[PDB]
Amino acid sequence: RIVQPVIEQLKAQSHPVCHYIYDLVGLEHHLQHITSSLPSNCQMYYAMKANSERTILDTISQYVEGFEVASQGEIAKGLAFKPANHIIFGGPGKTDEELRYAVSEGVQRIHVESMHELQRLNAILEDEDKTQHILLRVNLAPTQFGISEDEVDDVIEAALVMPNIHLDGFHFHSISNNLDSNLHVDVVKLYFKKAKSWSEKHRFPLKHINLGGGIGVNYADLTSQFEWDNFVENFKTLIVEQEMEDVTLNFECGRFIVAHIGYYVTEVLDIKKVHGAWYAILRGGTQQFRLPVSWQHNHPFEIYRYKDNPYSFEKVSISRQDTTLVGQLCTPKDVFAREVQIDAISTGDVIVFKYAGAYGWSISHHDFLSHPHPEFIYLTQ
Amino acid sequence: MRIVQPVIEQLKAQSHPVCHYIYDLVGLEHHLQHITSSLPSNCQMYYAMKANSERTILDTISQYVEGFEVASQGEIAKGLAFKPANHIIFGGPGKTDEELRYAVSEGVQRIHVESMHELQRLNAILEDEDKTQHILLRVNLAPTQFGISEDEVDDVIEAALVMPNIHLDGFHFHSISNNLDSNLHVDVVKLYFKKAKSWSEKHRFPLKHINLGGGIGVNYADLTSQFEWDNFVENFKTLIVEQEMEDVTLNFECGRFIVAHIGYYVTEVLDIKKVHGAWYAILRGGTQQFRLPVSWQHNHPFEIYRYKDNPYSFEKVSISRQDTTLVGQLCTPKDVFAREVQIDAISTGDVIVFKYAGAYGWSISHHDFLSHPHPEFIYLT
Numbered sequence: 001r002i003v004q005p006v007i008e009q010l011k012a013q014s015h016p017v018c019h020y021i022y023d024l025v026g027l028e029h030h031l032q033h034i035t036s037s038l039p040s041n042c043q044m045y046y047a048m049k050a051n052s053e054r055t056i057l058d059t060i061s062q063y064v065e066g067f068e069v070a071s072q073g074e075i076a077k078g079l080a081f082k083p084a085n086h087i088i089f090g091g092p093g094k095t096d097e098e099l100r101y102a103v104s105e106g107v108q109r110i111h112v113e114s115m116h117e118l119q120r121l122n123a124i125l126e127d128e129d130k131t132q133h134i135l136l137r138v139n140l141a142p143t144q145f146g147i148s149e150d151e152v153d154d155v156i157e158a159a160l161v162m163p164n165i166h167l168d169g170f171h172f173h174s175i176s177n178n179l180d181s182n183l184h185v186d187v188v189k190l191y192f193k194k195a196k197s198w199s200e201k202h203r204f205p206l207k208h209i210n211l212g213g214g215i216g217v218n219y220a221d222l223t224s225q226f227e228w229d230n231f232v233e234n235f236k237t238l239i240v241e242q243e244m245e246d247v248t249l250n251f252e253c254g255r256f257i258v259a260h261i262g263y264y265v266t267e268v269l270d271i272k273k274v275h276g277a278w279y280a281i282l283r284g285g286t287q288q289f290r291l292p293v294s295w296q297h298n299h300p301f302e303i304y305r306y307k308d309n310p311y312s313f314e315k316v317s318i319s320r321q322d323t324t325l326v327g328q329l330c331t332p333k334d335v336f337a338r339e340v341q342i343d344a345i346s347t348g349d350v351i352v353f354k355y356a357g358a359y360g361w362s363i364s365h366h367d368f369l370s371h372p373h374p375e376f377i378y379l380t381q
Numbered sequence: 382m383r384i385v386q387p388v389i390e391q392l393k394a395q396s397h398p399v400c401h402y403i404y405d406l407v408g409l410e411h412h413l414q415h416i417t418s419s420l421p422s423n424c425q426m427y428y429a430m431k432a433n434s435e436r437t438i439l440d441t442i443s444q445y446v447e448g449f450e451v452a453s454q455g456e457i458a459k460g461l462a463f464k465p466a467n468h469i470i471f472g473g474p475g476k477t478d479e480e481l482r483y484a485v486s487e488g489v490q491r492i493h494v495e496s497m498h499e500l501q502r503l504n505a506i507l508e509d510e511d512k513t514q515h516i517l518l519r520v521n522l523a524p525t526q527f528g529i530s531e532d533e534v535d536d537v538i539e540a541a542l543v544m545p546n547i548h549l550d551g552f553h554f555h556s557i558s559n560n561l562d563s564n565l566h567v568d569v570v571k572l573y574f575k576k577a578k579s580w581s582e583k584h585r586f587p588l589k590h591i592n593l594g595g596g597i598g599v600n601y602a603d604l605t606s607q608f609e610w611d612n613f614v615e616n617f618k619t620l621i622v623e624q625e626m627e628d629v630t631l632n633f634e635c636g637r638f639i640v641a642h643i644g645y646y647v648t649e650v651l652d653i654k655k656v657h658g659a660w661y662a663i664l665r666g667g668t669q670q671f672r673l674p675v676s677w678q679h680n681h682p683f684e685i686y687r688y689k690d691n692p693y694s695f696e697k698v699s700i701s702r703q704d705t706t707l708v709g710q711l712c713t714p715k716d717v718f719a720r721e722v723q724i725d726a727i728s729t730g731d732v733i734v735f736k737y738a739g740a741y742g743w744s745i746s747h748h749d750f751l752s753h754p755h756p757e758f759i760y761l762t
């Protein structure tokens with residue numbers, strides 16, 4: 001167990017247990033595997049919205065080609081660990097301030113999501129007397145993202161008449177949390193066919209395709225994860241099959257890169273029965289780890305049993321009960337897991353929520369009810 | 382929009398991008414004056430600061446209320462800037478040893494105790510510090526994680542009464558959230574009275590105080606049909622007399638009803654686009670700054686400020702009389718303020734004025750997701 005030595009040290013020093021713990025060794029091994037496996041014309045970028053903690057970005061920047069970013073704040077964070085010319089910038093509502101900032105820093109690509117954005121970017125580029133390499137984000141045939149497939153032709157033609165714009169190709173991000181590697185190869189096939197078709201029709205060279213992220217992780221069954229080696233094998237073949245060896249490619253994964261190496265670890269403060277149902281109240285809450293509520297699932301956990309008793313009255317101990325795990329918050333929505341069968345649990349024990357590395361802290365309402373933040377520990381050996 | 386229009390016009394005239402929380406403190410004071418002055422002499426109004434704990438809001442509210450209701454060490458600290466500890470009352474299902482010791486050290490007015498285990502942890506701290514503490518027992522009437530299951534209340538009363546460091550004042554009830562029915566709220570209070578009197582008579586301790594909770598509702602669907610406060614108060618006063626509660630001190634602890642109608646979230650339109658037949662308007666900011674609509678899964682009420690001028694050399698994007706989905710800048714399809722709502726006219730550069738944004742707006746939101754700059758805050762006086 002990676003987190004158990006840390007929990008024992010915290011218990012030994014009488015420190016409260018409410019922590020995010022990250023396995024950086026596991027992260028580096030995962031990254032090494034991913035990046036070394038790809039074909040030479042495809043690179044991994046990290047989509048930092050999954051987890052933009054500075055220590056996480058620092059570890060990740062050693063392996064990835066660069067960062068995908070979607071705001072001025074994320075550009076700023078990326079610039080601490082990568083040069084601007086390895087930062088790619090997406091998002092449906094890029095402000096004039098963000099675009100000017102991106103242009104000024106010299107970001108690698110801006111992924112343009114609409115005609116109006118193209119025109120706003122262009123006006124800035126004319127005012128600054130600079131050029132910019134772009135992709136056009138395509139929404140293949142409804143969400144708010146990218147250019148609707150049938151509108152794409154018009155935005156290509158507008159882009160090609162702008163001398164300040166260098167059109168590299170296309171950007172597709174149309175799927176989320178896909179666990180099926182064969183499906184993902186078929187989706188990449190579709191992206192190749194559409195990009196080649198627009199390139200031909202509009203008579204401009206297809207230099208680059210951003211294939212997006214959306215590679216899934218399994219929170220229900222932890223043993224059944226995305227078949228990366230299978231995917232990459234069939235991906236390499238597909239590139240030859242479609243004659244894309246000359247076209248440069250990138251992925252922009254968030255979740256798949258960091259999910260399994262993070263843990264949210266908290267101590268049991270209380271155990272109570274209310275109208276027949278058992279509850280375990282934990283330190284912290286869903287305002288520090290909102291992932292379970294966002295998904296409406298029971299988040300995977302293990303229990304560390306603590307033998308000692310810090311009080312002169314007895315613990316509350318139960319066994320073999322359907323138990324609802326909640327945090328400290330004053331809302332009935334503060335639930336990590338609802339009516340999960342628990343083998344044995346007492347006040348003073350520690351819950352270890354696994355697979356908490358992605359969209360855990362990053363999506364959470366940290367300061368609701370003004371609780372102190374959890375402590376952050378990054379394991380390096 | 383009468384209140385915020387002058388601000389929007391100044392922001393536009395000065396070339397400041399519009400993404401702001403705006404609060405009407407004159408409206409807040411008038412509202413508080415009316416509520417607190419209408420209560421009978423034995424009832425007090427506390428402000429439940431989780432609704433909005435912004436320092437300027439607390440500054441303004443502190444004049445008019447008896448005190449603050451708080452649910453963490455952080456909220457106690459924030460309350461202590463404008464009230465003494467003995468006008469702060471402390472609730473919540475997971476009060477840590479650290480929070481209890483801080484509450485006791487500062488001398489908080491009441492701790493609203495939610496379990497036997499908390500009672501014992503509080504009592505150990507009081508024996509160690511040689512202090513006494515006034516408490517209420519939070520009752521969960523006949524489920525949720527909050528308070529003491531009705532069946533278990535007798536046992537906790539008897540335990541509290543034999544602990545000499547504990548002063549049991551009475552009971553705390555908070556069941557209802559967002560009730561717009563004033564008559565029903567009177568009937569709920571009547572239940573609280575009868576239950577509290579029964580336990581007092583059974584165990585023969587003086588019924589000194591009852592905390593009646595918050596949960597006075599606000600109408601986000603129809604803004605013209607708000608809680609009939611004056612009706613509630615008249616019947617509440619009558620009920621006190623009928624139930625012979627004149628010598629029992631009472632308190633409410635309201636959040637939402639106090640601050641909801643005085644706050645606005647206002648933001649410029651960055652882009653309008655059609656994606657596979659569906660119209661979207663993309664706003665500056667996002668549901669990470671104003672999560673209320675997503676948390677509730679409703680369409681939040683708004684109005685449109687129609688801005689006359691154009692900063693660009695190209696035409697605005699405009700639509701008329703379409704089902705339109707309002708989204709922010711975030712790179713998630715869940716970033717939705719309002720789904721397929723009628724908009725009579727809207728253009729890029731217009732400002733959407735989200736009304737009733739004062740309670741559980743900024744306070745519940747995941748401020749730093751995607752690392753966007755915070756909205757600006759303006760307090761009107």
Ligand SMILES: *Cc1c(COP(=O)(O)O)cnc(C)c1O
Pocket residue numbers: 047049050068090091173176177212213214215252253254255256712713
């Ligand atoms: C959310 C997002 C990603 C990352 O998605 P994961 O599911 O975390 O891999 C990549 N690109 C874009 C444009 C996104 O919006």
Ligand SMILES: *Cc1c(COP(=O)(O)O)cnc(C)c1O
Pocket residue numbers: 330331429431432450472473555557558559594595596597634635636637638
């Ligand atoms: C949420 C809450 C309140 C305030 O609720 P509103 O609906 O904002 O009035 C008061 N007391 C307790 C114990 C709460 O959890």
